[PDB]
């Protein structure tokens, strides 16, 4: 089994609630499955090209059935990085995403990564009734840390990071998703440590059945 | 009246349905108010720093009450671009955003932009019972181009770019908003020219009352 541990937090497990929880998850997981390969993708230190005029131009050459040498140097560099990211995603069996909630959503590089990974003909295809995913046999976990509480109730409707990430994963075929919220630390700073510990314990149990 | 024309499309009006609608809106608007100042902010051609370890470190210094020169040169460049974006936004009276739908949301740079503009003490404050916007006297328009149809009914639940943008604007005090969908082109390519013209007329009418 190949696992991607995809993190989008500028802070380490020492200074981030999500990363402490994701770290506890991924280490309990390796312990349970010492023969599994686990690759960390730190999105703040990975090249994750934004879809821009260069990518659109590169795509036009490929659609025009042209080769890689028709691209400029920067287009080449952009496409080769997008290709790597796509190919690593497609080949792994399990995905762990760790995000903080910023302004009701995830950090911008998460959308940039999703844009690398959701590709027609590769991870989804067009159907008589509309798009369907191509990826089969995958499972995903989203661990999200949030100042307030959005995991259930009325505030769930503004949890855009979680809701959008789950939608795109389902769109590419990854309908088997798990969710861990590390929530309420800013609404109750007195309970932050126990909130963290409870989610850590939640993650370590999840590791035994993921 | 200062208008911000905030575009997130790699094509200009020539190859983007949203840009053709947004450009028509802006021309009709200038005809009605020749004295208004419209400033273009092309997010594909503007420095919009992502919040990262540098930014978190800079903010840590500002919180310690250190000065600008206690920052590394990299931190100063990111912070200076962030403050320029925040100040330009705070000072304008009108916002017109134009975005494509990519994978059920907007381009990543829109999230990076929102993260520069939603700042505690500047565009919102904490109160007893919840965060509150600080911006008054503002109006926004969102023009969104989408391949499918999401503006009403069931599929509105996955129109995450639209929904998130509205949420963040509302959080910062901009509750007076207008929305224009340019939708269904991909689902109905024989209708793309009619869809575009109908949406253009929709924009020209709004331009007279916006
Ligand atoms: C830039 C920024 C934006 C934030 N926006 C929200 C928000 O919209 N809603 C919320 O409940 N908390 C918000 N928070 C609080 C964080 O979600 C909370 O600190 C969380 O623990 C961050 O995750 P981490 O500890 O793994 O970094 C924000 C924090 C930052 C730094
Ligand atoms: C990378 C990419 C992703 C897209 N994702 C979606 C999508 O999730 N849902 C949809 O209805 N259309 C999607 N589309 C189609 C566009 O929304 C549609 O072509 C729209 O016109 C683009 O806006 P524009 O013409 O102003 O550039 C996508 C197009 C591209 C190029
Ligand atoms: O790093 S901090 O833990 O100090 C921190 C916490 C919350 C922060 N913002 N929180 C909220 C926010 O930005 C918006 C809505 C919220 C609703 C409920 C609870 C919290 C929030 C924040 C913003 C900038 C820098 C550091 C921040
Ligand atoms: O440039 S195109 O106008 O031909 C174009 C149209 C739709 C495209 N659609 N992508 C979709 C997509 O990524 C997800 C959901 C969709 C639902 C309905 C219709 C389209 C989509 C697309 C994707 C990549 C490059 C060019 C694209
Ligand atoms: Ca549990
Ligand atoms: K480790
Ligand atoms: K643009």
Short mmCIF file of C-alpha atoms and ligand atoms in Angstrom, two decimals:
data_model
loop_
_atom_site.label_atom_id
_atom_site.label_comp_id
_atom_site.label_asym_id
_atom_site.label_seq_id
_atom_site.Cartn_x
_atom_site.Cartn_y
_atom_site.Cartn_z
CA UNK A 1 0.00 0.00 0.00
CA UNK A 2 1.26 3.51 -1.02
CA UNK A 3 0.19 6.45 1.11
CA UNK A 4 0.50 10.16 0.33
CA UNK A 5 0.61 12.32 3.46
CA UNK A 6 -0.21 15.69 1.93
CA UNK A 7 0.20 18.62 4.27
CA UNK A 8 -0.68 22.30 3.75
CA UNK A 9 0.42 24.05 6.85
CA UNK A 10 3.48 26.35 7.08
CA UNK A 11 4.01 25.11 10.67
CA UNK A 12 5.44 21.81 11.95
CA UNK A 13 3.70 19.34 14.22
CA UNK A 14 5.25 21.31 17.11
CA UNK A 15 3.31 24.51 16.32
CA UNK A 16 0.08 23.44 14.58
CA UNK A 17 -2.93 21.50 15.91
CA UNK A 18 -3.72 19.84 12.51
CA UNK A 19 -0.06 18.77 12.06
CA UNK A 20 0.18 17.28 15.59
CA UNK A 21 -2.97 15.28 14.80
CA UNK A 22 -1.83 14.31 11.28
CA UNK A 23 1.57 13.35 12.60
CA UNK A 24 0.01 11.12 15.29
CA UNK A 25 -2.20 9.54 12.62
CA UNK A 26 0.55 8.86 10.10
CA UNK A 27 2.98 7.48 12.71
CA UNK A 28 0.35 5.15 14.26
CA UNK A 29 -0.37 4.06 10.68
CA UNK A 30 3.25 3.19 9.81
CA UNK A 31 3.54 1.33 13.09
CA UNK A 32 0.46 -0.77 12.19
CA UNK A 33 1.72 -1.33 8.67
CA UNK A 34 5.54 -1.29 8.62
CA UNK A 35 5.69 -2.52 5.03
CA UNK A 36 3.58 0.34 3.63
CA UNK A 37 5.34 3.17 1.70
CA UNK A 38 4.45 6.65 2.91
CA UNK A 39 5.56 9.73 0.92
CA UNK A 40 5.05 13.15 2.49
CA UNK A 41 4.02 15.95 0.10
CA UNK A 42 4.60 19.25 1.97
CA UNK A 43 2.60 21.59 -0.23
CA UNK A 44 4.46 24.67 1.04
CA UNK A 45 7.75 23.17 -0.25
CA UNK A 46 6.61 21.37 -3.45
CA UNK A 47 6.29 22.90 -6.90
CA UNK A 48 2.56 23.04 -7.60
CA UNK A 49 2.06 25.17 -10.76
CA UNK A 50 -1.04 27.33 -10.97
CA UNK A 51 -3.11 26.88 -14.12
CA UNK A 52 -2.14 30.11 -16.01
CA UNK A 53 -1.54 31.44 -19.58
CA UNK A 54 1.51 29.22 -19.99
CA UNK A 55 -0.39 26.04 -19.02
CA UNK A 56 -3.32 26.98 -21.27
CA UNK A 57 -0.77 27.52 -24.11
CA UNK A 58 0.91 24.16 -23.41
CA UNK A 59 -2.46 22.42 -23.41
CA UNK A 60 -3.26 23.97 -26.80
CA UNK A 61 -0.08 22.52 -28.34
CA UNK A 62 -0.83 19.05 -26.92
CA UNK A 63 -4.45 19.23 -28.18
CA UNK A 64 -2.96 20.34 -31.52
CA UNK A 65 -1.06 17.03 -31.16
CA UNK A 66 2.33 18.72 -30.69
CA UNK A 67 5.22 17.42 -28.61
CA UNK A 68 7.12 18.70 -25.57
CA UNK A 69 9.71 20.61 -27.68
CA UNK A 70 7.04 22.99 -29.00
CA UNK A 71 6.71 24.40 -25.44
CA UNK A 72 8.91 27.21 -24.18
CA UNK A 73 11.31 26.47 -21.28
CA UNK A 74 8.94 27.84 -18.61
CA UNK A 75 5.96 25.92 -20.10
CA UNK A 76 8.11 22.76 -20.09
CA UNK A 77 8.98 23.29 -16.40
CA UNK A 78 5.35 23.95 -15.48
CA UNK A 79 3.98 20.90 -17.27
CA UNK A 80 6.66 18.53 -15.98
CA UNK A 81 5.88 19.53 -12.39
CA UNK A 82 2.08 19.19 -13.02
CA UNK A 83 2.80 15.78 -14.59
CA UNK A 84 4.83 14.58 -11.55
CA UNK A 85 2.06 15.69 -9.15
CA UNK A 86 -0.63 13.99 -11.24
CA UNK A 87 1.37 10.78 -11.56
CA UNK A 88 2.24 10.50 -7.83
CA UNK A 89 -1.48 11.06 -6.91
CA UNK A 90 -2.77 8.51 -9.42
CA UNK A 91 -0.33 5.87 -8.23
CA UNK A 92 -0.87 6.06 -4.47
CA UNK A 93 -3.64 4.00 -2.73
CA UNK A 94 -4.47 6.27 0.24
CA UNK A 95 -4.43 10.08 0.77
CA UNK A 96 -4.12 12.00 4.04
CA UNK A 97 -4.73 15.76 3.80
CA UNK A 98 -3.93 18.07 6.70
CA UNK A 99 -5.24 21.62 6.51
CA UNK A 100 -5.98 24.60 8.70
CA UNK A 101 -9.12 26.64 8.17
CA UNK A 102 -8.21 30.16 6.99
CA UNK A 103 -11.11 32.56 6.18
CA UNK A 104 -13.64 29.71 5.96
CA UNK A 105 -11.49 27.62 3.56
CA UNK A 106 -8.08 25.89 3.12
CA UNK A 107 -4.76 27.52 2.06
CA UNK A 108 -4.61 28.47 -1.65
CA UNK A 109 -1.99 25.79 -2.57
CA UNK A 110 -4.65 23.13 -1.83
CA UNK A 111 -6.78 24.35 -4.70
CA UNK A 112 -3.60 24.53 -6.84
CA UNK A 113 -2.85 20.88 -5.99
CA UNK A 114 -6.45 19.77 -6.72
CA UNK A 115 -6.13 21.55 -10.09
CA UNK A 116 -2.97 19.47 -10.83
CA UNK A 117 -4.70 16.27 -9.86
CA UNK A 118 -8.17 16.58 -11.45
CA UNK A 119 -7.44 15.93 -15.16
CA UNK A 120 -9.88 14.80 -17.89
CA UNK A 121 -8.91 11.51 -19.46
CA UNK A 122 -6.70 10.77 -16.44
CA UNK A 123 -8.69 11.01 -13.18
CA UNK A 124 -12.18 11.66 -14.61
CA UNK A 125 -13.98 11.34 -17.96
CA UNK A 126 -17.05 12.85 -19.59
CA UNK A 127 -20.23 10.77 -19.53
CA UNK A 128 -23.70 10.79 -21.14
CA UNK A 129 -25.01 12.02 -17.74
CA UNK A 130 -21.90 13.98 -16.80
CA UNK A 131 -18.36 13.61 -15.35
CA UNK A 132 -17.39 10.40 -13.55
CA UNK A 133 -14.18 9.52 -11.66
CA UNK A 134 -11.57 7.16 -13.06
CA UNK A 135 -9.79 6.35 -9.79
CA UNK A 136 -10.86 3.10 -8.07
CA UNK A 137 -9.59 1.44 -4.87
CA UNK A 138 -8.63 4.64 -3.05
CA UNK A 139 -9.37 5.98 0.42
CA UNK A 140 -8.83 9.48 1.85
CA UNK A 141 -8.65 11.15 5.23
CA UNK A 142 -9.02 14.90 5.75
CA UNK A 143 -7.76 16.24 9.06
CA UNK A 144 -8.73 19.92 9.50
CA UNK A 145 -8.00 22.30 12.36
CA UNK A 146 -10.40 25.22 12.86
CA UNK A 147 -10.68 28.03 15.45
CA UNK A 148 -14.52 27.73 15.76
CA UNK A 149 -16.74 24.59 15.50
CA UNK A 150 -18.13 23.69 12.02
CA UNK A 151 -18.21 19.88 11.97
CA UNK A 152 -22.02 19.74 12.47
CA UNK A 153 -24.95 22.14 12.77
CA UNK A 154 -25.71 25.38 10.97
CA UNK A 155 -22.03 26.35 10.65
CA UNK A 156 -21.35 23.21 8.58
CA UNK A 157 -22.69 25.19 5.53
CA UNK A 158 -19.68 27.55 5.69
CA UNK A 159 -17.05 24.78 6.10
CA UNK A 160 -15.87 25.34 2.51
CA UNK A 161 -12.43 23.72 2.75
CA UNK A 162 -13.80 20.43 3.94
CA UNK A 163 -16.86 20.49 1.65
CA UNK A 164 -14.98 21.44 -1.46
CA UNK A 165 -12.11 18.96 -0.87
CA UNK A 166 -14.59 16.13 -0.34
CA UNK A 167 -16.46 17.12 -3.54
CA UNK A 168 -13.35 17.03 -5.78
CA UNK A 169 -12.14 13.76 -4.24
CA UNK A 170 -15.55 12.20 -4.96
CA UNK A 171 -15.43 13.70 -8.43
CA UNK A 172 -12.19 11.83 -9.27
CA UNK A 173 -13.45 8.51 -7.86
CA UNK A 174 -12.34 8.79 -4.17
CA UNK A 175 -15.71 8.49 -2.52
CA UNK A 176 -14.36 6.63 0.54
CA UNK A 177 -13.33 9.57 2.75
CA UNK A 178 -12.84 10.00 6.47
CA UNK A 179 -12.86 13.29 8.40
CA UNK A 180 -11.20 14.42 11.63
CA UNK A 181 -11.95 17.88 12.95
CA UNK A 182 -9.57 19.46 15.52
CA UNK A 183 -11.97 22.26 16.38
CA UNK A 184 -12.92 24.96 18.88
CA UNK A 185 -9.39 25.83 20.15
CA UNK A 186 -9.92 29.55 19.58
CA UNK A 187 -13.52 29.53 20.89
CA UNK A 188 -12.31 27.80 24.04
CA UNK A 189 -8.58 28.36 24.55
CA UNK A 190 -8.80 26.81 28.04
CA UNK A 191 -9.79 23.51 26.48
CA UNK A 192 -7.31 23.65 23.55
CA UNK A 193 -4.94 21.03 25.08
CA UNK A 194 -7.73 18.51 25.73
CA UNK A 195 -9.28 19.23 22.36
CA UNK A 196 -5.88 18.39 20.82
CA UNK A 197 -5.45 15.25 22.94
CA UNK A 198 -8.93 13.95 22.14
CA UNK A 199 -8.27 14.39 18.34
CA UNK A 200 -4.84 12.80 18.67
CA UNK A 201 -6.58 9.78 20.32
CA UNK A 202 -9.23 9.83 17.61
CA UNK A 203 -6.42 9.74 14.94
CA UNK A 204 -4.51 6.86 16.61
CA UNK A 205 -7.67 4.69 16.70
CA UNK A 206 -8.48 5.61 13.08
CA UNK A 207 -4.98 4.43 12.11
CA UNK A 208 -5.84 0.89 13.22
CA UNK A 209 -8.74 0.69 10.75
CA UNK A 210 -7.66 2.88 7.87
CA UNK B 1 -16.18 56.45 -6.43
CA UNK B 2 -13.26 54.04 -6.76
CA UNK B 3 -14.02 50.71 -8.48
CA UNK B 4 -11.74 47.64 -8.21
CA UNK B 5 -11.98 45.39 -11.30
CA UNK B 6 -10.45 42.17 -9.90
CA UNK B 7 -9.98 39.55 -12.60
CA UNK B 8 -8.82 35.91 -12.22
CA UNK B 9 -8.74 34.60 -15.72
CA UNK B 10 -5.62 33.76 -17.78
CA UNK B 11 -7.38 34.85 -21.02
CA UNK B 12 -8.63 38.34 -21.81
CA UNK B 13 -12.13 39.06 -23.21
CA UNK B 14 -11.09 37.40 -26.50
CA UNK B 15 -10.98 33.88 -25.07
CA UNK B 16 -12.93 34.00 -21.78
CA UNK B 17 -16.75 34.19 -21.39
CA UNK B 18 -16.42 35.73 -17.94
CA UNK B 19 -13.97 38.37 -19.17
CA UNK B 20 -16.25 39.33 -22.13
CA UNK B 21 -19.10 39.84 -19.63
CA UNK B 22 -16.89 41.69 -17.08
CA UNK B 23 -15.43 43.90 -19.80
CA UNK B 24 -18.92 44.78 -21.14
CA UNK B 25 -20.00 45.60 -17.54
CA UNK B 26 -17.00 47.90 -17.04
CA UNK B 27 -17.50 49.82 -20.33
CA UNK B 28 -21.25 50.37 -19.72
CA UNK B 29 -20.30 51.44 -16.19
CA UNK B 30 -17.71 54.00 -17.38
CA UNK B 31 -20.25 55.45 -19.85
CA UNK B 32 -22.67 56.07 -16.94
CA UNK B 33 -19.96 57.48 -14.64
CA UNK B 34 -17.15 59.01 -16.75
CA UNK B 35 -15.66 60.54 -13.55
CA UNK B 36 -15.40 57.26 -11.62
CA UNK B 37 -11.94 55.73 -11.30
CA UNK B 38 -11.68 52.06 -12.27
CA UNK B 39 -8.42 50.26 -11.39
CA UNK B 40 -7.72 46.85 -12.90
CA UNK B 41 -6.30 44.19 -10.71
CA UNK B 42 -5.26 41.24 -12.77
CA UNK B 43 -4.57 38.56 -10.21
CA UNK B 44 -2.57 36.59 -12.80
CA UNK B 45 -0.30 39.64 -13.05
CA UNK B 46 -0.26 41.03 -9.48
CA UNK B 47 1.90 39.94 -6.57
CA UNK B 48 -0.48 38.29 -4.11
CA UNK B 49 1.59 36.64 -1.41
CA UNK B 50 0.31 33.36 0.00
CA UNK B 51 0.33 33.18 3.77
CA UNK B 52 3.42 31.06 4.53
CA UNK B 53 6.15 30.51 7.16
CA UNK B 54 7.70 33.87 6.17
CA UNK B 55 4.38 35.68 6.69
CA UNK B 56 3.70 33.90 10.00
CA UNK B 57 7.24 34.87 11.15
CA UNK B 58 6.73 38.52 10.07
CA UNK B 59 3.41 38.66 11.93
CA UNK B 60 5.13 37.16 14.98
CA UNK B 61 7.57 40.08 14.89
CA UNK B 62 4.83 42.71 14.46
CA UNK B 63 3.03 41.07 17.43
CA UNK B 64 6.25 41.35 19.44
CA UNK B 65 6.06 45.01 18.38
CA UNK B 66 9.23 44.88 16.30
CA UNK B 67 9.57 47.05 13.23
CA UNK B 68 9.66 46.43 9.49
CA UNK B 69 13.48 46.20 9.49
CA UNK B 70 13.44 43.23 11.88
CA UNK B 71 12.14 41.28 8.84
CA UNK B 72 14.32 39.43 6.35
CA UNK B 73 14.27 40.90 2.83
CA UNK B 74 11.94 38.09 1.67
CA UNK B 75 9.46 38.79 4.50
CA UNK B 76 9.44 42.52 3.71
CA UNK B 77 8.60 41.90 0.03
CA UNK B 78 5.67 39.59 0.90
CA UNK B 79 4.39 41.89 3.61
CA UNK B 80 4.69 45.02 1.43
CA UNK B 81 2.69 43.36 -1.34
CA UNK B 82 0.07 42.16 1.21
CA UNK B 83 -0.37 45.66 2.68
CA UNK B 84 -0.60 47.21 -0.79
CA UNK B 85 -3.44 44.77 -1.65
CA UNK B 86 -5.23 45.31 1.67
CA UNK B 87 -5.01 49.09 1.46
CA UNK B 88 -6.13 49.24 -2.19
CA UNK B 89 -9.19 47.07 -1.22
CA UNK B 90 -10.10 48.94 1.96
CA UNK B 91 -10.04 52.25 0.12
CA UNK B 92 -12.11 51.35 -2.94
CA UNK B 93 -15.91 51.72 -2.93
CA UNK B 94 -16.81 48.99 -5.45
CA UNK B 95 -15.57 45.53 -6.25
CA UNK B 96 -16.18 43.59 -9.45
CA UNK B 97 -14.74 40.06 -9.40
CA UNK B 98 -14.61 37.86 -12.47
CA UNK B 99 -13.76 34.16 -12.19
CA UNK B 100 -14.09 30.90 -14.14
CA UNK B 101 -15.33 27.79 -12.35
CA UNK B 102 -12.40 25.29 -12.21
CA UNK B 103 -13.17 22.03 -10.42
CA UNK B 104 -16.19 23.54 -8.60
CA UNK B 105 -14.36 26.56 -7.26
CA UNK B 106 -12.27 29.60 -8.36
CA UNK B 107 -8.59 29.91 -9.34
CA UNK B 108 -6.30 29.52 -6.31
CA UNK B 109 -5.09 33.17 -6.53
CA UNK B 110 -8.61 34.31 -5.49
CA UNK B 111 -8.15 32.53 -2.20
CA UNK B 112 -4.67 34.10 -1.88
CA UNK B 113 -6.26 37.51 -2.53
CA UNK B 114 -9.05 36.99 0.02
CA UNK B 115 -6.42 35.97 2.55
CA UNK B 116 -4.61 39.40 1.96
CA UNK B 117 -7.87 41.40 2.36
CA UNK B 118 -9.47 39.70 5.41
CA UNK B 119 -7.28 41.06 8.23
CA UNK B 120 -8.25 41.51 11.94
CA UNK B 121 -8.23 45.14 13.04
CA UNK B 122 -8.44 46.24 9.42
CA UNK B 123 -11.41 44.63 7.71
CA UNK B 124 -13.10 42.78 10.62
CA UNK B 125 -12.95 42.79 14.45
CA UNK B 126 -13.64 40.28 17.19
CA UNK B 127 -16.62 41.10 19.44
CA UNK B 128 -18.30 39.31 22.38
CA UNK B 129 -20.62 37.18 20.24
CA UNK B 130 -18.60 36.81 17.05
CA UNK B 131 -16.39 38.44 14.39
CA UNK B 132 -17.86 41.50 12.67
CA UNK B 133 -17.02 43.23 9.40
CA UNK B 134 -15.50 46.72 9.50
CA UNK B 135 -16.09 47.75 5.91
CA UNK B 136 -19.09 50.08 5.32
CA UNK B 137 -20.39 51.77 2.15
CA UNK B 138 -19.27 49.00 -0.20
CA UNK B 139 -20.92 47.05 -2.98
CA UNK B 140 -19.66 44.00 -4.84
CA UNK B 141 -20.46 42.16 -8.05
CA UNK B 142 -19.36 38.62 -8.89
CA UNK B 143 -19.43 37.56 -12.49
CA UNK B 144 -18.74 33.82 -12.74
CA UNK B 145 -18.37 31.72 -15.89
CA UNK B 146 -19.18 28.01 -15.58
CA UNK B 147 -19.36 25.14 -18.09
CA UNK B 148 -22.46 23.69 -16.40
CA UNK B 149 -25.46 25.24 -14.62
CA UNK B 150 -25.17 25.91 -10.88
CA UNK B 151 -26.97 29.21 -10.33
CA UNK B 152 -30.13 27.60 -8.83
CA UNK B 153 -31.51 24.21 -7.77
CA UNK B 154 -29.60 21.22 -6.38
CA UNK B 155 -26.21 21.92 -8.01
CA UNK B 156 -26.00 25.28 -6.23
CA UNK B 157 -24.68 23.36 -3.21
CA UNK B 158 -21.37 22.66 -5.07
CA UNK B 159 -20.93 26.22 -6.46
CA UNK B 160 -18.14 26.66 -3.92
CA UNK B 161 -16.34 29.53 -5.61
CA UNK B 162 -19.45 31.65 -5.67
CA UNK B 163 -20.57 30.62 -2.18
CA UNK B 164 -17.19 31.11 -0.49
CA UNK B 165 -16.56 34.48 -2.11
CA UNK B 166 -19.96 35.75 -0.92
CA UNK B 167 -19.21 34.45 2.60
CA UNK B 168 -15.85 36.22 2.87
CA UNK B 169 -17.19 39.49 1.50
CA UNK B 170 -20.09 39.33 4.01
CA UNK B 171 -17.65 38.59 6.85
CA UNK B 172 -15.66 41.78 6.06
CA UNK B 173 -18.86 43.89 5.97
CA UNK B 174 -19.63 43.83 2.22
CA UNK B 175 -23.23 42.58 2.43
CA UNK B 176 -24.51 44.44 -0.64
CA UNK B 177 -23.68 42.04 -3.45
CA UNK B 178 -24.82 41.17 -6.99
CA UNK B 179 -24.13 37.93 -8.88
CA UNK B 180 -24.05 37.26 -12.59
CA UNK B 181 -23.67 33.68 -13.85
CA UNK B 182 -22.45 33.04 -17.42
CA UNK B 183 -23.40 29.40 -17.45
CA UNK B 184 -24.19 26.31 -19.46
CA UNK B 185 -21.81 26.97 -22.40
CA UNK B 186 -20.15 23.58 -22.11
CA UNK B 187 -23.39 21.70 -21.46
CA UNK B 188 -24.94 23.38 -24.46
CA UNK B 189 -22.23 24.49 -26.91
CA UNK B 190 -24.77 25.38 -29.70
CA UNK B 191 -26.18 27.93 -27.23
CA UNK B 192 -22.81 29.46 -26.12
CA UNK B 193 -23.21 32.67 -28.20
CA UNK B 194 -26.75 33.29 -26.98
CA UNK B 195 -25.78 32.56 -23.37
CA UNK B 196 -22.92 35.07 -23.66
CA UNK B 197 -25.08 37.81 -25.25
CA UNK B 198 -27.89 37.33 -22.74
CA UNK B 199 -25.31 37.68 -19.91
CA UNK B 200 -23.74 40.71 -21.58
CA UNK B 201 -27.19 42.45 -21.69
CA UNK B 202 -27.65 41.42 -18.05
CA UNK B 203 -24.34 43.15 -17.25
CA UNK B 204 -25.12 46.32 -19.24
CA UNK B 205 -28.44 46.77 -17.41
CA UNK B 206 -26.81 46.20 -14.00
CA UNK B 207 -24.04 48.66 -14.90
CA UNK B 208 -26.63 51.43 -14.94
CA UNK B 209 -27.82 50.78 -11.38
CA UNK B 210 -24.61 49.59 -9.85
C1 LIG C 1 -5.00 33.55 8.44
C2 LIG C 1 -5.95 32.81 9.35
C3 LIG C 1 -7.32 32.72 9.03
C4 LIG C 1 -8.20 32.00 9.86
N1 LIG C 1 -9.55 31.89 9.53
C5 LIG C 1 -10.42 31.19 10.35
C6 LIG C 1 -11.77 31.05 10.03
O1 LIG C 1 -12.22 31.54 8.98
N2 LIG C 1 -12.60 30.34 10.90
C7 LIG C 1 -12.10 29.79 12.06
O2 LIG C 1 -12.82 29.20 12.85
N3 LIG C 1 -10.76 29.94 12.38
C8 LIG C 1 -9.93 30.63 11.53
N4 LIG C 1 -8.60 30.72 11.87
C9 LIG C 1 -8.16 30.06 13.17
C10 LIG C 1 -7.47 28.75 12.75
O3 LIG C 1 -8.37 27.99 11.97
C11 LIG C 1 -6.97 27.95 13.94
O4 LIG C 1 -5.91 28.69 14.43
C12 LIG C 1 -6.38 26.60 13.56
O5 LIG C 1 -5.89 25.98 14.70
C13 LIG C 1 -5.21 26.70 12.58
O6 LIG C 1 -4.77 25.39 12.36
P1 LIG C 1 -3.28 24.87 12.81
O7 LIG C 1 -3.23 24.90 14.31
O8 LIG C 1 -3.12 23.43 12.37
O9 LIG C 1 -2.37 25.75 12.03
C14 LIG C 1 -7.72 31.42 11.05
C15 LIG C 1 -6.37 31.56 11.38
C16 LIG C 1 -5.48 32.23 10.52
C17 LIG C 1 -4.02 32.32 10.91
C1 LIG C 2 -9.18 23.59 -15.47
C2 LIG C 2 -10.64 23.74 -15.78
C3 LIG C 2 -11.55 23.27 -14.83
C4 LIG C 2 -12.93 23.37 -15.03
N1 LIG C 2 -13.80 22.88 -14.05
C5 LIG C 2 -15.19 22.99 -14.21
C6 LIG C 2 -16.10 22.54 -13.22
O1 LIG C 2 -15.72 22.04 -12.15
N2 LIG C 2 -17.46 22.65 -13.46
C7 LIG C 2 -17.93 23.24 -14.64
O2 LIG C 2 -19.12 23.34 -14.88
N3 LIG C 2 -17.04 23.69 -15.59
C8 LIG C 2 -15.67 23.59 -15.38
N4 LIG C 2 -14.79 24.05 -16.37
C9 LIG C 2 -15.36 24.71 -17.59
C10 LIG C 2 -15.31 26.24 -17.39
O3 LIG C 2 -15.91 26.64 -16.16
C11 LIG C 2 -15.95 27.00 -18.55
O4 LIG C 2 -15.24 26.62 -19.71
C12 LIG C 2 -15.94 28.52 -18.36
O5 LIG C 2 -16.35 29.22 -19.51
C13 LIG C 2 -14.54 29.03 -18.07
O6 LIG C 2 -14.61 30.42 -17.79
P1 LIG C 2 -14.08 31.50 -18.90
O7 LIG C 2 -14.68 31.20 -20.22
O8 LIG C 2 -14.36 32.95 -18.58
O9 LIG C 2 -12.61 31.25 -18.87
C14 LIG C 2 -13.41 23.96 -16.19
C15 LIG C 2 -12.52 24.44 -17.15
C16 LIG C 2 -11.13 24.33 -16.96
C17 LIG C 2 -10.23 24.88 -18.05
O1 LIG C 3 -2.45 32.08 15.13
S1 LIG C 3 -3.57 32.35 16.08
O2 LIG C 3 -3.88 31.12 16.86
O3 LIG C 3 -3.09 33.40 17.02
C1 LIG C 3 -4.87 32.88 15.27
C2 LIG C 3 -6.14 32.39 15.58
C3 LIG C 3 -7.31 32.81 14.94
C4 LIG C 3 -7.35 33.77 13.92
N1 LIG C 3 -8.60 34.08 13.30
N2 LIG C 3 -9.68 33.52 13.68
C5 LIG C 3 -10.99 33.62 13.12
C6 LIG C 3 -11.21 34.27 11.78
O4 LIG C 3 -10.15 34.86 11.15
C7 LIG C 3 -12.49 34.29 11.20
C8 LIG C 3 -13.61 33.71 11.81
C9 LIG C 3 -13.52 33.04 13.05
C10 LIG C 3 -14.65 32.46 13.65
C11 LIG C 3 -14.56 31.80 14.88
C12 LIG C 3 -13.32 31.71 15.53
C13 LIG C 3 -12.14 32.27 14.98
C14 LIG C 3 -12.19 32.95 13.75
C15 LIG C 3 -6.03 34.35 13.48
C16 LIG C 3 -5.94 35.30 12.46
C17 LIG C 3 -4.68 35.82 12.12
C18 LIG C 3 -3.50 35.42 12.76
C19 LIG C 3 -3.54 34.47 13.79
C20 LIG C 3 -4.77 33.91 14.18
O1 LIG C 4 -11.40 24.85 -22.72
S1 LIG C 4 -12.71 24.17 -22.80
O2 LIG C 4 -13.79 25.20 -22.89
O3 LIG C 4 -12.75 23.30 -24.01
C1 LIG C 4 -12.98 23.29 -21.49
C2 LIG C 4 -14.31 23.12 -21.15
C3 LIG C 4 -14.72 22.38 -20.05
C4 LIG C 4 -13.85 21.73 -19.19
N1 LIG C 4 -14.53 21.10 -18.14
N2 LIG C 4 -14.10 20.65 -17.07
C5 LIG C 4 -15.02 20.17 -16.11
C6 LIG C 4 -14.48 19.73 -14.79
O4 LIG C 4 -13.13 19.71 -14.55
C7 LIG C 4 -15.36 19.31 -13.80
C8 LIG C 4 -16.76 19.30 -13.96
C9 LIG C 4 -17.38 19.71 -15.14
C10 LIG C 4 -18.78 19.68 -15.26
C11 LIG C 4 -19.41 20.10 -16.45
C12 LIG C 4 -18.63 20.55 -17.52
C13 LIG C 4 -17.23 20.60 -17.44
C14 LIG C 4 -16.54 20.19 -16.28
C15 LIG C 4 -12.37 21.85 -19.44
C16 LIG C 4 -11.40 21.25 -18.64
C17 LIG C 4 -10.04 21.41 -18.98
C18 LIG C 4 -9.63 22.15 -20.10
C19 LIG C 4 -10.57 22.77 -20.93
C20 LIG C 4 -11.93 22.65 -20.64
CA1 LIG C 5 -13.72 8.66 15.77
K1 LIG C 6 7.45 12.01 11.23
K1 LIG C 7 -6.96 37.93 -14.88
#
